[PDB]
Ligand binder design. Structure first.
Ligand SMILES: CCCCCCCCCCCCC/C=C/[C@@H](O)[C@H](COP(=O)(O)O)NC(=O)CCCCCCCCCCC
Length: 208
């Protein structure tokens, strides 16, 4: 019943007719990713908590007195910039602003998209560990302190084989998994592109 396709396709729900990035569905989709990650039984389950803690921050903003301004990422950015609830230069009175919090998930989404795309078009003899590192170095690595970068990089060598990873998506044999990624990744890509435009245009790509 539960599989990676269900999660990827849930990202369709994150964009409305005006391509507002809706926060509730975004959270729901990320909870799907966490459940998938935890199902893989790798050492990276050690880091699921960081995602979960970030989702809870966002859920608490959605449960608060300004909940309506957190309905979409676009609304969130407008509200937090106009009320100075985002630390722009250095961490200060708003260490857990919606803007800086969502940024971390967004960067991770970028990594995930690069990793899954890499996997989708990889040769049969490609190593999962290499797909992960190359995509990590492309993306998330620059935002992590050296101690984290080095530990993550080493941990990559302990990942399952390409075949096992594809089968773990639970959508059939590797060949079916590969076609699934092609049909489903565009949903996560669209969410990423719209979110990246939002952050880029507001010069928020480097929030502390
Ligand atoms: C299945 C193999 C998964 C490979 C995942 C490779 C990337 C792992 C990154 C681990 C980062 C170390 C944990 C804590 C990092 C935090 O410092 C940063 C910055 O947050 P801040 O401290 O400023 O609040 N947090 C992040 O970069 C977000 C956590 C990354 C989530 C990884 C996505 C895994 C989802 C997999 C779903 C298939």
């Amino acid at each position: 019943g539960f599989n990676l396709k269900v999660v990827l396709v849930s990202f369709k729900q994150c964009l409305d007719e005006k391509e507002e990035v809706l926060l509730d569905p975004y959270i729901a989709s990320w909870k799907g990713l966490v459940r998938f990650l935890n199902s893989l039984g790798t050492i990276f389950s050690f880091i699921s908590k960081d995602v979960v803690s970030k989702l809870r921050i966002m859920e608490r903003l959605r449960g608060g007195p300004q909940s309506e301004h957190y309905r979409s990422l676009q609304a969130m950015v407008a509200h937090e910039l106009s009320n100075r609830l985002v630390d722009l230069e250095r961490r200060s009175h708003h260490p857990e602003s919606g803007c800086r919090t969502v940024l971390r998930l967004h960067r991770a989404l970028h990594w995930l998209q690069l990793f899954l795309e890499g996997l989708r078009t990889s040769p049969e003899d490609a190593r999962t560990s290499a797909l992960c590192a190359d995509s990590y170095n492309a993306s998330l690595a620059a935002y992590h302190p050296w101690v984290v970068r080095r530990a993550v990089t080493v941990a990559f060598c302990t990942l399952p084989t390409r075949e096992v990873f594809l089968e773990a998506m639970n959508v059939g044999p590797p060949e079916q998994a590969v076609q699934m990624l092609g049909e489903a990744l565009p949903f996560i890509q669209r969410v990423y592109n719209v979110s990246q435009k939002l952050y880029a245009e507001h010069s928020l790509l480097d929030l502390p």
